[PDB]
Design a binder for this molecule. Structure first.
Ligand SMILES: CCCCCCCCCCCCCCCCCC(=O)OC[C@H](COP(=O)([O-])OCC[N+](C)(C)C)OC(=O)CCCCCCCCCCCCCCCCC
Ligand SMILES: CCCCCCCCCCCCCCCCCC(=O)OC[C@H](COP(=O)([O-])OCC[N+](C)(C)C)OC(=O)CCCCCCCCCCCCCCCCC
Ligand SMILES: CCCCCCCCCCCCCCCCCC(=O)OC[C@H](COP(=O)([O-])OCC[N+](C)(C)C)OC(=O)CCCCCCCCCCCCCCCCC
Ligand SMILES: CCCCCCCCCCCCCCCCCC(=O)OC[C@H](COP(=O)(O)OCCN)OC(=O)CCCCCCCCCCCCCCCCC
Ligand SMILES: CCCCCCCCCCCCCCCCCC(=O)OC[C@H](COP(=O)(O)OCCN)OC(=O)CCCCCCCCCCCCCCCCC
Ligand SMILES: CCCCCCCCCCCCCCCCCC(=O)OC[C@H](COP(=O)(O)OCCN)OC(=O)CCCCCCCCCCCCCCCCC
Ligand SMILES: CCCCCCCCCCCCCCCCCC(=O)OC[C@H](COP(=O)(O)OCCN)OC(=O)CCCCCCCCCCCCCCCCC
Ligand SMILES: CCCCCCCCCCCCO[C@@H]1O[C@H](CO)[C@@H](O[C@H]2O[C@H](CO)[C@@H](O)[C@H](O)[C@H]2O)[C@H](O)[C@H]1O
Ligand SMILES: CCCCCCCCCCCCO[C@@H]1O[C@H](CO)[C@@H](O[C@H]2O[C@H](CO)[C@@H](O)[C@H](O)[C@H]2O)[C@H](O)[C@H]1O
Ligand code: SF4
Ligand code: SF4
Ligand code: SF4
Lengths: 178, 157, 44, 115, 318
């Protein structure tokens, strides 16, 4: 099914009434007045502006923000250096090295995320089998240098220790959809 | 310190405040990151309420917001319009592409970070950064300008 | 039991989508009559 | 004297702002900054080459119509005349022929811009 | 004392101009569901001063292809002429009382176009030349009818003296007998001030910035100061010609208060119009003026020659 957007060409004769209405519309700018009415009506509407940074835009638990590395409730790292996140990373933003820890544990010695390569796609956190790497809720981490956005393992673990309380609560809210 | 140093310091504050309060970015956007820049100008965030107004002429602009991917074919043109901004001028790198090449870092046709072409004051991460994340970076540029000490340094020369 | 995001039972209320611009304003005669009356009065 | 005084002050104020604007700011002159703007690419020619005027006929018609209004601007003094009928006919004829001139140029497509 | 009077005209007019930049940005904002400036000062009332201080602390352009004398002269001429247009304005008593004050306005306003023409030419860049040639077309469009519109109105005034318009309207707005000319006059002042929907000499979507594209810093500010001063001037002129503020010989300040209110309102409709309409094409502005306004303006000039004769309503010479 289709409709015409501009086929109103049922040409008809013109009375004095309609000719005068057409004349009034041209000479008195009536449709231009309707435009002013619309902008006037917005003048008296409450604006949609929020008072950033005292107010914030709404977000959801799924929001993909700054990365972090998480722990188990004991403090043990969750990451076991499987490299699934590194393999899937569409930007090759992740670089990992690992070796047996002093207690024999399978753990990383390098876990880097180039935040200026990363596309914030969340594929790493889907691929992680142990919920180790996550994108947290933080989006306010702009820096004054490029180098500050090349995160190493210490930075990423500090983000985890910094943001776990909110990260844990967001995972509790969404994990049944995953 | 002295009363001449105090007066110089208060003048630094005044000129700094003026440039903080009237930052005019160039109408300049490269790719998807520019869409979020539009959303910072849109009513919810209304950048104009902070004093931020786009002007199309580089001669009338203070900030360049590199909002998107910078290709090799585009690089000379971006350098040209940066050079044609009168000073003092600032650069905000917005998004992974501008920050360091992002998803296209390994391409034959892409500049791996606009900071190979122009100096950068603020790096805003994200792909794209949200309109709010960009606004945060703009407010971080303002605080950077608040820290400028050009008149104090002139006095001590 | 399974809990998903579903429409309410019975569906949602109907949604307007067709163009709706009001018809408003005076006839052509009334506008010209008011405008010509202002002129004649001013001339006087 | 008063009109001279205020206009000089107006000139004086404008020139002072120009001097402040050119001597207060820090400068940094280099060639790429001062080259002409053209959206980030270099111009391919001078801006001093001929720029075609498609409304050139309207432009020289405007010269004649501007002397027609010069003939109309004495009308406030002319309506004070005892010879009201003569003045009225002269003004009516003047406006009518100017209308006929505009009507002719309109029907000759003289107000259409050239392509 | 005459020097004090110059200050009490120029300084308040320059502050009124500065705050019109604020009012425009807030009125446009609210019509766009935004707020506009509300941080730099209370409710944004220091935002104009910040923009002014920023511009004059900025490096001013010295482009290489530029012919420098006209480049400097044009913005200087712009602000001079904008301020000069105010000296004969009777509010209700003018600073300078001119016998042909209306003709002074036309001549001064007509010289104002040369600041646009010379700046665009002197800059010696393509987008600035485009803006200059649009100014040529703009003046050809509206100047053809603006003086005839004024002519017809002043056949009820009886002179070119601005102060006489106050007496002419002692019992009635000139709007009432002249509303068709008032409508055409109002559109002409929009074009005369290069305001939307006729903001063609700058037109930023097409020419980037048109005539002033090569201008930076304080020289750029002069063009902006001159444009916002002229908007107030042309609406104040529209107020005195068609909306005769109430005059009482023993209450002059009543005229000034009423004049300001109507002038403020007419300036607001300029900002309201900018927020509402798209831009004309600059060939379409010429056709609007020469094929619609000009026929009616000529007919109405003939009608307003005819009227005082057949009603025996010729105004006094003095
Ligand atoms: C000429 C016009 C100048 C008029 C403006 C001057 C005041 C500007 C500062 C202002 O109002 O904002 C306050 C600002 C407002 O704070 P703010 O600008 O830093 O923070 C804004 C962000 N929110 C909204 C979240 C608060 O106060 C400051 O903290 C900055 C200090 C600026 C001081 C300006 C100079 C002081 C006066 C020195 C005069 C010269 C000394 C001679 C010896
Ligand atoms: C409508 C507005 C029109 C008017 C606009 C006026 C706006 C200005 C308001 C007043 C503030 C003026 C400050 C200067 C403007 C900034 C220019 C600039 O940044 O140049 C930086 C320059 C840079 O200096 P520099 O030496 O460091 O730079 C060297 C070269 N480069 C740039 C490569 C590093 O600094 C100056 O030259 C400062 C000179 C002004 C000093 C301030 C006045 C002296 C006060 C002394 C104290 C007296 C105490 C007496 C009582 C005891
Ligand atoms: C012409 C003078 C116009 C004065 C307008 C007000 C601006 C005052 C501040 C700038 C003073 C410039 C100056 O004359 O410096 C001495 C000049 C140097 O001028 P300048 O090149 O340093 O001017 C730039 C000023 N600063 C550093 C603040 C950006 O030296 C001479 O003695 C040459 C004579
Ligand atoms: C007794 C004796 C009686 C004799 C007197 C009779 C007088 C009758 C009244 C006539 C008044 C008409 C004024 C002239 C304006 C006009 O009518 O021109 C219409 C013009 C062209 O209209 P257009 O749709 O393009 O069609 C072209 C062919 N008409 O279109 C326009 O001009 C519109 C331009 C507007 C541009 C937007 C600017 C802002 C408008 C809002 C202003 C709010 C204040
Ligand atoms: C200068 C004013 C020129 C004369 C104004 C009179 C025009 C008018 O009456 O407005 C009519 C308009 C309705 O629009 P429309 O549907 O086209 O009318 C059908 C007419 N046969 O009416 C409306 O749009 C409704 C009013 C909404 C606008 C309110 C603001 C008034 C704007 C006029 C002030 C201009 C400044
Ligand atoms: C930079 C360029 C700036 C130029 C500004 C342009 C201003 C528009 C053009 C002004 C020319 C018209 C001036 C005018 O008509 O004033 C006439 C005035 C006498 O006024 P009048 O009404 O005849 O009353 C006398 C009898 N009671 O006569 C007088 O009162 C004094 C003599 C008039 C001459 C003044 C001319 C303006 C000042 C120019 C300054 C130099 C500019 C360079
Ligand atoms: C900038 C600063 C903001 C402006 C500050 C002044 C705002 C003042 C607001 C109060 C205005 C009160 C006017 C009465 C409005 C309520 C009302 O009774 O409606 C009157 C009329 C519509 O009446 P109604 O019966 O409801 O509709 C069907 C009629 N056929 O509707 C009308 O025709 C009334 C028209 C009122 C116009 C004045 C308000 C607009 C002022 C802004 C002018 C444009 C600024 C640019
Ligand atoms: C009887 C003759 C008397 C002796 C005359 C001597 C004249 C010598 C003038 C030297 C130049 C002074 O003129 C000024 O120089 C400075 C720095 O030097 C330059 O100014 C600007 O450009 C350069 C570009 O790199 C920057 O380094 C400088 O900081 C900046 O201010 C300009 O060139 C000019 O603004
Ligand atoms: C080809 C171009 C055509 C366009 C030009 C047409 C011009 C023709 C004009 C015809 C109208 C003349 O209109 C004429 O006006 C004069 C006054 O002005 C009237 O004159 C009347 O009033 C005057 C005072 O003014 C008395 O002195 C006179 O005795 C009396 O007749 C005439 O009664 C009327 O006929
Ligand atoms: S969010 Fe995407 S691009 Fe960024 S590190 Fe994870 S998988 Fe790589
Ligand atoms: S973060 Fe997860 S996916 Fe990546 S190496 Fe560690 S355990 Fe494997
Ligand atoms: S960083 Fe992401 S959103 Fe921004 S331009 Fe590059 S791909 Fe698009």
């Amino acid at each position: 099914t289709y409709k015409y957007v501009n086929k109103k060409e049922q040409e008809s004769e013109v009375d004095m009434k309609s000719a005068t209405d057409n004349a009034a519309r041209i000479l008195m700018w009536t449709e231009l007045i309707r435009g002013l009415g619309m902008t006037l009506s917005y003048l008296f509407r409450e604006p949609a502006t929020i008072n950033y940074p005292f107010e914030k835009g709404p977000l959801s638990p799924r929001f993909r923000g700054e990365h972090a590395l998480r722990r188990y409730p004991s403090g043990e790292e969750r990451c076991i250096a499987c490299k699934l996140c590194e393999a899937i990373c569409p930007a090759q933003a992740i670089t990992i090295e690992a070796e047996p820890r002093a207690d024999g544990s399978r753990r990383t010695t390098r876990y880097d995320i180039d935040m200026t390569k990363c596309i914030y796609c969340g594929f790493c956190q889907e691929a992680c089998p142990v919920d180790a790497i996550v994108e947290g809720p933080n989006f306010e981490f702009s820096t004054e240098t490029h180098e500050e956005l090349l995160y190493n393992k210490e930075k990423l673990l500090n983000n985890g220790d910094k943001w776990e309380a909110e990260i844990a609560a967001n995972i509790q809210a969404d994990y049944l959809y995953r | 310190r002295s009363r001449a140093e105090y007066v110089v310091t208060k003048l630094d504050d005044l000129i700094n405040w003026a440039r903080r309060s009237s930052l005019w970015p160039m109408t300049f956007g490269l790719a998807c990151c520019a869409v979020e820049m539009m959303h910072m100008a849109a009513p919810r965030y209304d950048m104009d309420r902070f004093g931020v107004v786009f002007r199309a002429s580089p001669r009338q602009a203070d900030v360049m917001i590199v909002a998107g991917t910078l290709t090799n074919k585009m690089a000379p043109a971006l350098r040209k319009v940066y050079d044609q901004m009168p000073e003092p001028r600032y650069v905000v790198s917005m998004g992974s592409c501008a920050n360091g090449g992002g998803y296209y870092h390994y391409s034959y046709s892409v500049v791996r970070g606009c900071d190979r072409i122009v100096p950068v004051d603020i790096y805003v991460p994200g792909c794209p950064p949200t309109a709010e994340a960009l606004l945060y970076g703009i407010l971080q540029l303002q605080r950077k300008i608040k820290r400028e000490q050009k008149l104090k340094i002139w006095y001590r020369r | 039991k399974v809990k998903q995001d579903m429409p309410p039972p019975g569906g949602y209320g109907p949604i307007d989508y067709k163009r709706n611009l009001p018809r408003r304003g005076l006839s052509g005669y009334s506008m010209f009559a008011v405008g010509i009356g202002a002129l004649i009065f001013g001339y006087w | 004297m008063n009109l001279y005084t205020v206009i000089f002050i107006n000139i004086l104020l404008s020139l002072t702002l120009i001097l402040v604007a050119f001597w207060l700011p820090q400068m940094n002159l280099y060639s790429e900054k001062a080259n002409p703007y053209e959206c980030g690419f270099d111009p391919t020619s001078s801006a001093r080459l001929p720029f075609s005027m498609k409304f050139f006929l309207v432009a020289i018609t405007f010269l004649l119509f501007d002397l027609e209004i010069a003939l109309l601007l004495p009308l406030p003094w002319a309506i004070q005349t005892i010879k009201t009928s003569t003045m009225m006919i002269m003004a009516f004829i003047l406006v009518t022929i100017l209308s006929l001139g505009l009507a002719y140029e309109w029907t000759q497509k003289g107000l259409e811009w050239t392509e | 004392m005459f020097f004090i009077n110059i200050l009490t005209l120029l300084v308040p007019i320059l502050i009124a101009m500065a705050f019109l930049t604020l009012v425009e940005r807030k009125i446009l904002g609210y019509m766009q569901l935004r707020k506009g400036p509300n941080i730099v000062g209370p409710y944004g009332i220091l935002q104009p001063f910040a923009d002014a201080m920023k511009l004059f602390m900025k490096e001013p352009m010295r482009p290489l292809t530029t012919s420098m004398s006209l480049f400097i002269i044009a913005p200087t001429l712009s602000l001079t002429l904008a301020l000069s247009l105010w000296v004969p304005l009777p509010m209700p008593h003018p600073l300078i009382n001119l016998n042909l004050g209306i003709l002074f306005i036309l001549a001064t306003s007509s010289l104002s176009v040369y600041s646009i023409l010379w700046s665009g030419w002197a800059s010696n860049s393509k987008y600035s030349l485009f803006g200059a040639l649009r100014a040529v077309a703009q003046t050809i469009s509206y100047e053809v009818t603006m003086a005839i519109i004024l002519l017809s109105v002043l056949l009820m005034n009886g002179s070119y003296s601005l102060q006489t318009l106050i007496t002419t309207q002692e019992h009635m707005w000139l709007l009432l007998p002249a509303w068709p000319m008032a409508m055409m006059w109002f559109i002409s002042t929009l074009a005369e001030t290069n305001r939307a929907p006729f903001d063609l000499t700058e037109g930023e979507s097409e020419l980037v910035s048109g005539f002033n594209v090569e201008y930076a810093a304080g020289p750029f500010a002069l063009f902006f100061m001159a444009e916002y001063t002229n908007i107030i001037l042309m609406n104040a002129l529209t107020t005195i010609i068609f909306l005769g503020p109430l005059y009482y010989i023993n209450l002059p300040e009543l005229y000034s208060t009423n004049f300001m209110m109507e002038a403020l309102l007419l300036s607001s409709t300029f900002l309201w119009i900018r927020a509402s309409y798209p831009r004309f094409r600059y060939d379409q502005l010429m056709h609007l003026l020469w094929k619609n306004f000009l026929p009616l303006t000529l007919a109405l000039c003939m009608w307003h020659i005819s009227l005082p004769i057949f009603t025996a309503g010729v105004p006094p010479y003095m």
